[PDB]
Amino acid sequence: IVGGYTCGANTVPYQVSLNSGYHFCGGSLINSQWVVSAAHCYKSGIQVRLGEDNINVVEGNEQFISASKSIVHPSYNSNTLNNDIMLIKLKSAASLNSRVASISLPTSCASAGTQCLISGWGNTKSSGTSYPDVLKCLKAPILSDSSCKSAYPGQITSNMFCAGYLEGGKDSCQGDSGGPVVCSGKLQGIVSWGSGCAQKNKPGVYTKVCNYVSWIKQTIASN
Ligand SMILES: COc1ccc2c(CCN)c[nH]c2c1
Numbered sequence: 001i002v003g004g005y006t007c008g009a010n011t012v013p014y015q016v017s018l019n020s021g022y023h024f025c026g027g028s029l030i031n032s033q034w035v036v037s038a039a040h041c042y043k044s045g046i047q048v049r050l051g052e053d054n055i056n057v058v059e060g061n062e063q064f065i066s067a068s069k070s071i072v073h074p075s076y077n078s079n080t081l082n083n084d085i086m087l088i089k090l091k092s093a094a095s096l097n098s099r100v101a102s103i104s105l106p107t108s109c110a111s112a113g114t115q116c117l118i119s120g121w122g123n124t125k126s127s128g129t130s131y132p133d134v135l136k137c138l139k140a141p142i143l144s145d146s147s148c149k150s151a152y153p154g155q156i157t158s159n160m161f162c163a164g165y166l167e168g169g170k171d172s173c174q175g176d177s178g179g180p181v182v183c184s185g186k187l188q189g190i191v192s193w194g195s196g197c198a199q200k201n202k203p204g205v206y207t208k209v210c211n212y213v214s215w216i217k218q219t220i221a222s223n
Pocket residue numbers: 171172173174175176177191192193194195196197198203204205
């Protein structure tokens with residue numbers, strides 16, 4: 001997260017870290033057994049880390065649970081990033097508590113102008129690299145689809161939305177991939193792609209979760 005702030009330990013209790021020997025992506029806990037992340041975060045050997053603040057220190061509220069199954073969206077296209085969503089099932093159910101909590105799926109699609117919370121352990125610099133230990137947060141509004149398409153002509157599908165700032169300086173970045181965009185207490189977006197981080201006229205692009213609620217619900221009812 002570039003241009004954000006330190007969330008505060010466990011104040012984003014649905015935020016997970018995906019670990020393959022090191023943190024490589026975020027995700028969102030949607031119930032005791034399932035995490036939503038980006039399809040571009042798919043890899044083998046995923047351990048889901050819940051209850052994290054400092055990802056380099058065991059602080060006492062973590063749960064580390066291996067993935068037992070990953071399900072990338074059937075229509076995910078890695079070249080265009082259309083349908084950039086994946087489900088991860090936990091080998092055992094997480095114990096839900098004040099530091100480990102699920103986030104509800106949306107009932108409707110959030111509207112332009114709505115303020116949302118984006119979080120992760122990604123790079124905090126728009127030029128160069130610096131990776132934080134504690135979870136970072138950014139408040140960012142959803143942008144109109146006309147402004148989103150103007151920023152990324154020919155690239156925004158109906159499964160994507162832009163959030164952030166056209167002036168740059170505040171954005172999600174490398175390593176925030178797969179993490180949550182939460183608006184009105186619901187998971188509306190997944191950190192998906194952009195042109196760099198926090199660049200002028202290049203706001204972050206996010207998977208439009210509301211389009212996937214039926215797929216999520218049917219998949220978790222059968223796996
Ligand atoms: C390889 O560099 C990057 C830089 C930024 C991003 C993002 C978020 C952009 N708002 C998702 N994946 C990335 C990969």
